[PDB]
Amino acid sequence: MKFTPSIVIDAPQYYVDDLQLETESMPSSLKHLTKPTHILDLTNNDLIMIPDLSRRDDIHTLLLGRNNIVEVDVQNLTLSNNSIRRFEDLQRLRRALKNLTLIGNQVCHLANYREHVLRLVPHLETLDFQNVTAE
Amino acid sequence: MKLVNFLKKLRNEQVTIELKNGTTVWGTLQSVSPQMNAILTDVKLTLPSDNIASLQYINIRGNTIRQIILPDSLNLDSLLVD
Amino acid sequence: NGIPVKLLNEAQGHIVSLELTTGATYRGKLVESEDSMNVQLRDVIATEPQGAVTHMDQIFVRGSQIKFIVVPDLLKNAPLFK
Amino acid sequence: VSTPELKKYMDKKILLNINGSRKVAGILRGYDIFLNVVLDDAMEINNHQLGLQTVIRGNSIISLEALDA
Amino acid sequence: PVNPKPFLKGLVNHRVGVKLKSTEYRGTLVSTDNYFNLQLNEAEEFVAGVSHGTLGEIFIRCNNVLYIRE
Amino acid sequence: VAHSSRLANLIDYKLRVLTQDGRVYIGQLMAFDKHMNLVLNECIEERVPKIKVEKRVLGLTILRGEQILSTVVEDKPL
Amino acid sequence: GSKFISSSEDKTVRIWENQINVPIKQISDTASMPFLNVHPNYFCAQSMDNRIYSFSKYKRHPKKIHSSAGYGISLAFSGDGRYICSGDSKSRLFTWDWNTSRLLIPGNKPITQVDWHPSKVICSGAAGKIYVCD
Amino acid sequence: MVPPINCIFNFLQQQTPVTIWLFEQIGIRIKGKIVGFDEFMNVVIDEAVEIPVNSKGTPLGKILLKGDNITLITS
Amino acid sequence: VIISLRNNHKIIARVKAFDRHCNMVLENVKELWTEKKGKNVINRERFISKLFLRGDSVIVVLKTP
RNA sequence: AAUUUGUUACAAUACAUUUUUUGGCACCGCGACCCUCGCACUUGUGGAGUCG
Known part of the structure; x- marks a missing residue:
């Protein structure tokens, strides 16, 4: 069940509680959404890598709950319950982002995980639903 | 008599359009209303010293369109016939 | 006749929001509307373009100077459209 | 086509918010289908009255917010 | 007794000046219509009371007009 | 997006909309x-202060x- | 079927279906059709300026500008030039052309109407006379 | 009710000190006497006087000020 | 002929069409303006072959003999 | 073992001078502190004090 153009065209489309598309092993063929969504819900799928996106200027929210994200190739990124294991794997997020959630990922239990994210991704204001504070 | 008619007659033309706010708009006129509301396809919006933004379909309003820059080759007299 | 006009009329009674050309948003019970969006409203707050807010009783607004009107989402349901 | 229903506001003092961030006050005496206003005169908003009665053009009116309830 | 349109009609083949939505003008009136569009000869462009240039034969669009004067 | 003739034929499509003041209304x-x-189903005004959306x-x-400048198609139906 | 045949100065001949009330068939081949006659074969002979056709051709040089059909399949054609153009109906051949004597103007010589009995021919003429051709 | 047209007519009949405001133009005003009347707000006003507004007096002749740029009347 | 315009554009061009609204079809078109962010002084003009024009833009048309 | 005809209804095929399309265009939030533990359908939402 490839993420295909045909798949995207029959997918529930609605205004959420922003314009959101309701959605797989590999992220691909996003061209067909035509950059018309503010949010894309990819929860409960089997994606391994957050990569493969076309240029999408609209896209501001990515809900990627319960997948198998182990590597990273936009204002809000929800990655709860995935497979990121090393602090260094979170490095690509420095190039984006204000709301970040990485709970229920092995990486969470690494020593200094919170401080590492804060220094390497300073643009984040809320991390794991807690305010990044000055201290 | 009417320029509206002339406009209508101009179909499927890849043209630049200029607005009251100066925006240059490169697109194929698929249709135009009786009140000059331009309907373009294969559209390309550029400002008058900054980067470009392209779009598939744009319906621009008649009041906004200052000057429609016509095509290169065009027989005008013929067009002007009723 | 205009379906937006009809919608506006229907919204009579309801609490509509309403911005003008000036950019001064109002919210209030829509008392009366006309073909030209000549709205009257009750119990109406009035935001300034800069920020500050002011309560006021029975505002009238002329549709010419109105920009956009927000109606409650219940009217989406029925039964004007079909 | 239809008349602006301002019969509620007849013979009451109204803040005519007018073009260019200006104001007018005064008691409402009449109007027409173009929303021109005929009103017994008052000040321009510190403050200074001009005229005995005044006529405001339709186009110029932003708003006519009622001073009296 | 004197309405505007008749005054306008009378003032054909005579000197007039026009302000705009701003720059003053000065020229002899050729003809007028119901919409109050103008056609003038010996047009002089008074840029805030400064005759910048003398254009000659001109046609003023109605909506930009402010007032007429001798 | 499809290759329509008029606006009426593309009813209920998600629409980007520009207005003279510079705001951008998006909705069906x-x-x-x-x-x-225009009646818009789920409308979001998006403005840009003199920086970011x-x-x-x-x-x-x-x-x-009056205030509408031009309309663009944001997405398909539903 | 068609219960009414009609001929008009738009140079057409329509075959009508009356119950539904609309044209069953259109015959445009005429270049005003001023006369028709029904063969007593279920067909019609239609006329025009220079060409007399038939309908379920007839050789004509300019005869311009009525028709009558004998039971023997003889097809009469009255002229405005005063010439009486007789035809066979089957062929299209013209076996005779006559010229009437005007009266005691040369413009007034023509044939306005004509008919056969139920072996004789009766032609009203523009000269204020009826003539009987045997 | 007193319509606007009626008011205008009355003013014309009177010949009184009229002070006109300009649409989308704060700094300038006009002051004269109404002579003409039109179907629209346009009128002719002889012996007019242009005024710079208090945030003096300036010379001006006979004028018709166009109906679209009118705002206020008083007479 | 030359045309003055609301947006400070001196349109020197050959007229082809004409109507009630003073919209114009134009050939041999040569506009004149000044792209200039202050303090600066530049005078620019471009040739265009064929060009439609809207009437609200038009302030004053003129004819130089 | 769909086609044609008639009737009824709706939609499409006009114009510039105030309300739309002949334009008046152009040159609460962020530091601090503390209050409230409440079952809803929302302009907005604690309060004192400091910063913008």
Whole structure:
């Protein structure tokens, strides 16, 4: 069940509680959404890598709950319950982002995980639903 | 008599359009209303010293369109016939 | 006749929001509307373009100077459209 | 086509918010289908009255917010 | 007794000046219509009371007009 | 997006909309007008202060055509 | 079927279906059709300026500008030039052309109407006389 | 009710000190006497006087000020 | 002929069409303006072959003999 | 073992001078502190004090 153009065209489309598309092993063929969504819900799928996106200027929210994200190739990124294991794997997020959630990922239990994210991704204001504070 | 008619007659033309706010708009006129509301396809919006933004379909309003820059080759007299 | 006009009329009674050309948003019970969006409203707050807010009783607004009107989402349901 | 229903506001003092961030006050005496206003005169908003009665053009009116309830 | 349109009609083949939505003008009136569009000869462009240039034969669009004067 | 002739034929499509003031209304066109006034189903006004996109969700909106500049298609139906 | 045949100065001949009330068939081949006659074969002979056709051709040089059909399949054609053009109906051949004597103007010599009995021919003429051709 | 047209007519009949405001133009005003009347707000006003507004007096002749740029009347 | 315009554009061009609204079809088109962010002084003009024009833009048309 | 005809209804095929399309265009939030533990459908939402 490839993420295909045909798949995207029959997918529930609605205004959420922003314009959101309701959605797989590999992220691909996003061209067909035509950059018309503010949010894309990819929860409960089997994606391994957050990569493969076309240029999408609209896209501001990515809900990627319960997948198998182990590597990273936009204002809000929800990655709860995935497979990121090393602090260094979170490095690509420095190039984006204000709301970040990485709970229920092995990486969470690494020593200094919170401080590492804060220094390497300073643009984040809320991390794991807690305010990044000055201290 | 009417320029509206002339406009209508101009179909499927890849043209630049200029607005009251100066925006240059490169697109194929698929249709135009009786009140000059331009309907373009294969559209390309550029400002008058900054980067470009392209779009598939744009319906621009008649009041906004200052000057429609016509095509290169065009027989005008013929067009002007009723 | 205009379906937006009809919608506006229907919204009579309801609490509509309403911005003008000036950019001064109002919210209030829509008392009366006309073909030209000549709205009257009750119990109406009035935001300034800069920020500050002011309560006021029975505002009238002329549709010419109105920009956009927000109606409650219940009217989406029925039964004007079909 | 239809008349602006301002019969509620007849013979009451109204803040005519007018073009260019200006104001007018005064008691409402009449109007027409173009929303021109005929009103017994008052000040321009510190403050200074001009005229005995005044006529405001339709186009110029932003708003006519009622001073009296 | 004197309405505007008749005054306008009378003032054909005579000197007039026009302000705009701003720059003053000065020229002899050729003809007028119901919409109050103008056609003038010996047009002089008074840029805030400064005759910048003398254009000659001109046609003023109605909506930009402010007032007429001798 | 499809290759339409008119606006009326593309009813209920998610629409980007520009207005003279510079705001951008986005939402599904429920109903059109003789004077291009638009009813929008789920309308979001998106504005840009003199930096980055400020955002406001409005709801069901009647939008006057005087102020409308131009409309663009954001996405397909549903 | 068609219960009414009609001929008009738009140079057409329509075959009508009356119950539904609309044209069953259109015959445009005429270049005003001023006369028709029904063969007593279920067909019609239609006329025009220079060409007399038939309908379920007839050789004509300019005869311009009525028709009558004998039971023997003889097809009469009255002229405005005063010439009486007789035809066979089957062929299209013209076996005779006559010229009437005007009266005691040369413009007034023509044939306005004509008919056969139920072996004789009766032609009203523009000269204020009826003539009987045997 | 007193319509606007009626008011205008009355003013014309009177010949009184009229002070006109300009649409989308704060700094300038006009002051004269109404002579003409039109179907629209346009009128002719002889012996007019242009005024710079208090945030003096300036010379001006006979004028018709166009109906679209009118705002206020008083007479 | 030359045309003055609301947006400070001196349109020197050959007229082809004409109507009630003073919209114009134009050939041999040569506009004149000044792209200039202050303090600066530049005078620019471009040739265009064929060009439609809207009437609200038009302030004053003129004819130089 | 769909086609044609008639009737009824709706939609499409006009114009510039105030309300739309002949334009008046152009040159609460962020530091601090503390209050409230409440079952809803929302302009907005604690309060004192400091910063913008």
